Amino acid sequence: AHFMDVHRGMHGITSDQLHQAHQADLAVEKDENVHFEQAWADPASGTIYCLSEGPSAEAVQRVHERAGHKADEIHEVPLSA
Amino acid sequence: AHFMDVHRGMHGITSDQLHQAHQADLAVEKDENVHFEQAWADPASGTIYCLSEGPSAEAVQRVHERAGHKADEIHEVPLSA
Ligand code: NI
Ligand code: NI
Ligand code: NI
Ligand code: NI
């Protein structure tokens, strides 16, 4: 399955910080067979969008939680175009 | 530049309908130098996410408007990982 998740209220995100948050997820995703495909950030609003492939939203969230940043919002996105 | 926009209230949207919306955007995006790279939809919550490339949020929204569906939110995502 695929998921879009959102982390809000981020303080002063830089490309370095985004790179590291993403790397922290990638480092431990194997333990849930999750694949963090892509992350985009809006540093002005303080928001990180994460696209992942995984068995379930719960799995994706267990990964974020271990990497110390549980997503504020997550939706399965079974449709794409 | 890069943008992520969100449409809500699309509960129960089908693959055909997402494809239709997407095609409607693509059909008029070129005039604004906008390209919709990816569209994902969650028919359960009724949430659509669109990743686009373009000169501004204004342009992207003008395209959505001509296509018949203004986005409820649009944010620039200058950072990606
Ligand atoms: Ni995928
Ligand atoms: Ni497409
Ligand atoms: Ni918002
Ligand atoms: Ni914003």
* CB contact burial B37-76 (16+ within 10 A = b; e otherwise): eebbbbbebebbbbbbebeebebbbbbbebbeeebeebbb
Of A22, A40, A80, the CB nearest to B77: A40
Residue A79: list chain B partners with CB under 8 A.
13-15, 18, 40-43
CATH number at residue B81: 3.30.70.3090
- Residue with tokens 């919550």, as numbered in its chain: B45
Which of these, B34, B39, B42, lies nearest to B62 by C-alpha position? B34
Q: CA-CA distance, A79 to B21, in Å (whole number)?
A: 12
Which experimental method was this entry solved with? X-ray
Give the domain range for residue B46: 1-81
Residue B39: list chain A partners with CB under 8 A.
80-81
Ligand 4 centroid to Cα of residue A66, in Å, is 27
Task: For residue B15, give every residue at least 6 positions away whose Cβ sits within 8 Å of its Cβ, in sequence order, or none.
Answer: A79, A81
Own/partner contacts of A19-24, CB < 8 Å, gap of 24 or more, are A19/B81, A21/A48, A21/A67, A21/A69, A21/B81, A22/B81, A24/A67, A24/A68, A24/A69
Count of domains in chain B?
1
Task: For residue B21, give every residue at least 6 positions away whose Cβ sits within 8 Å of its Cβ, in sequence order, or none.
Answer: B39, B48, B67, B69
Which of these, A31, A17, A16, A18, lies nearest to A65 by C-alpha position? A31
Which residue stretches of B1-81 are H helix? 15-29, 57-67
- Residue with tokens 């990497």, as numbered in its chain: A67
Contact assignment for A40 to B13 by CB distance below 8 Å: no
